[PDB]
Design a protein around this ligand. Structure first.
Ligand SMILES: O=C(Nc1cc([C@@H]2CCCN2)[nH]n1)Nc1cccc2c1[C@@H]1CCCN1C2=O
Length: 273
């Protein structure tokens, strides 16, 4: 719209492109997302929390839709790329995970799923906060829960916990946990690490629409091999976020009281700009 001046492309989102823009009327720098609903989006406008990027305005004009969000200094993927030589320090990984769980517990209690969590849409500021973006709107497959890969259409909030498990693991080891390049390769990288699932660990799995009896049968690896050198409290919380069965996967509210968070603090990151 004519009230905005775009400075540059910030990035592509699930349902559209995002630009950094300045709003002439306010002089504020903003993140402007041009889409490709009205009601489902206006609801999101009222979803405010410290760990959720704020939806400022919705502009439905000339049969077009633009969502105006607060602009956040940097994204987590850029931050992880910049720290891959020394790795993000643990006190910071723990702070970020804890704040992420708070925003997810808040969205989840309002029945709002994220569905596409990834480092690119996790936003961090100079003060140590982190925020969920590209939310409640509803291609990298790396953070996709197995139930989506197996063609389940009525998935739950547990899909977000799984994606968050994957990110947590990546922040610790500085390597993507399951970097698949197609849906079947994605499923197989998961099975190769966590074991091919069966009716014992995941009741109803052989009944998923895309489940095939011909899937190879792989043994599960130990998590101590998967996430060195995460401590035992961290590994145990992680194994609970990565349970195959969505009904057994830990919820965000429950994970907030896990012993891994006993010593959380909110350190300030060292970020370049
Ligand atoms: O506020 C920001 N800040 C930034 C900054 C950056 C960049 C990307 C390269 C360097 N840092 N991405 N996002 N981003 C932002 C704000 C509101 C909504 C969204 C986003 C991101 C961009 C990708 C999809 N996202 C959204 O749906």
């Amino acid at each position: 719209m004519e009230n905005f001046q775009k400075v540059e492309k910030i990035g592509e989102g699930t349902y559209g492109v995002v630009y950094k823009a300045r709003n002439k009327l306010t002089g504020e720098v903003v993140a402007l997302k041009k889409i490709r609903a009205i009601r489902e989006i206006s609801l999101l406008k009222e979803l405010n929390h410290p760990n959720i990027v704020k939806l400022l305005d919705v502009i439905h004009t000339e049969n077009k839709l633009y969502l105006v969000f607060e602009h956040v200094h940097q994204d987590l993927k850029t931050f992880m790329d910049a720290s891959a030589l020394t790795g993000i320090p643990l006190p910071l990984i723990k702070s970020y995970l804890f704040q992420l769980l708070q925003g997810l517990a808040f969205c989840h209690s309002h029945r709002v799923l994220h569905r596409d969590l990834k480092p690119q849409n996790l936003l961090i500021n100079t003060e140590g906060a982190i925020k969920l973006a590209d939310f409640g709107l509803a291609v990298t497959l790396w953070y996709r829960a197995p139930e989506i890969l197996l063609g389940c259409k009525y998935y739950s909030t547990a899909v977000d916990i799984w994606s968050l498990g994957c990110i947590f693991a990546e922040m610790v080891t500085r390597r993507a946990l399951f970097p698949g390049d197609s849906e079947i390769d994605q499923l197989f990288r998961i099975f190769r690490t966590l074991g091919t699932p069966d009716e014992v660990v995941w009741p109803g799995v052989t009944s998923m629409p895309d489940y095939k009896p011909s899937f190879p049968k792989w043994a599960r690896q130990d998590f101590s091999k998967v996430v060195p050198p995460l401590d035992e409290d961290g590994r145990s919380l992680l194994s609970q976020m990565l349970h195959y069965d969505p009904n057994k996967r830990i919820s965000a509210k429950a994970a907030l009281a896990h012993p891994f968070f006993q010593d959380v603090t909110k350190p300030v990151p060292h970020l370049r700009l």
